[PDB]
């Protein structure tokens, strides 16, 4: 079934964080607003509603989340560890890091900006989008990436983690170090 207004109230804390862990909810109403953090870990939710607003961070670790629609506003970070997300939509306003470890993610939006750290660890992604900007640490360990785009920006450390990079960006300014 689907979450109602009264069922929403029974999964909210004092400061306004929605906890849906292991709960049997399949879809959320459109134009959904959360006062604080949102947790949809281990949920059978396969799609996030259009116009979704989260006043905190989105937690979807080891969930069945697959599709996020554009226009979603997230003030905190996005944690989609172990979910079933295959692509990242364009135009997501993310106020924090993006953790996509152990996901079937294949494609990323062009010129994507991550205000925090980025993770593509053990993902089947083949190539990073052109003009990528990362303000934190980039972990690509165990992924299928082997060629970086012509231009990219990482303001922290770059962790190869084991994968072999052969074509480095022509224009790259690094605020940290590169680790294998």
């Amino acid at each position: 079934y689907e979450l109602d207004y009264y069922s929403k109230f029974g999964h909210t804390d004092n400061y306004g964080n929605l906890d849906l862990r292991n709960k049997p909810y399949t879809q959320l109403p459109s134009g959904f607003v959360v006062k604080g953090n949102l947790n949809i870990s281990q949920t059978p939710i396969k799609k996030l509603p259009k116009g979704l607003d989260v006043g905190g961070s989105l937690e979807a670790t080891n969930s069945a989340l697959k599709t996020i629609r554009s226009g979603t506003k997230i003030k905190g970070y996005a944690n989609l560890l172990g979910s079933k997300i295959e692509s990242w939509p364009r135009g997501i306003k993310l106020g924090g890091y993006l953790n996509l470890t152990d996901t079937p993610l294949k494609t990323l939006p062009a010129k994507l900006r991550v205000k925090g750290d980025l993770s593509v660890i053990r993902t089947p992604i083949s190539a990073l989008p052109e003009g990528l900007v990362v303000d934190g640490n980039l972990y690509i360990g165990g992924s299928a990436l082997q060629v970086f785009p012509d231009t990219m920006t990482v303001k922290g450390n770059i962790f190869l983690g084991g994968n072999k990079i052969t074509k480095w960006p022509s224009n790259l300014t690094l605020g940290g170090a590169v680790a294998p």
């Binding site: 109230f9 029974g10 999964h11 004092n14 400061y15 906890d19």
Partner: protein
């Protein structure tokens, strides 16, 4: 060897200490409506795990929070009350914490006996050759 018993039993001594501290924080936060970190505390549990990697030490793999819904109480005049007027309190269950308190103490003390038992065997093994 008999020294591996000390590593295995010693790991359980630390393991049961983690669960005791987690229970202590649960008992002390059973009536705390507010919390720094913008999160209404929820009951935490230490999930043990055998690290097979003969001798199988026990390791704490991380603390996990309770899945029970928070206890909602209608307190309309509280500053933390929502529009409907309900304030939410942690889902700490007193009875399970008391049961965890007993089990953690009983398991902690029986690991001391095994370490003591292995100690005597090593001392006798050293008396051979003298």
């Amino acid at each position: 060897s008999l020294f591996n018993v000390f590593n295995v039993t010693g790991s359980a001594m630390s393991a049961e200490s983690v669960r005791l501290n987690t229970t202590s924080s649960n008992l002390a936060n059973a009536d705390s409506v507010s919390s720094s970190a913008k999160d209404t505390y929820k009951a935490r549990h230490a999930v043990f795990g055998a690290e097979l990697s003969d001798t199988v030490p026990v390791k704490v793999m991380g603390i996990v929070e309770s899945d029970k819904p928070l206890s909602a109480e209608y307190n309309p005049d509280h500053p933390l009350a929502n529009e409907e007027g309900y304030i939410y309190k942690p889902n700490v269950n007193v009875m399970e914490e008391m049961a965890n308190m007993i089990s953690a103490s009983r398991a902690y003390q029986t690991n001391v006996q095994v370490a003591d038992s292995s100690k005597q065997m090593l001392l006798r093994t050293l008396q051979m050759g003298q």
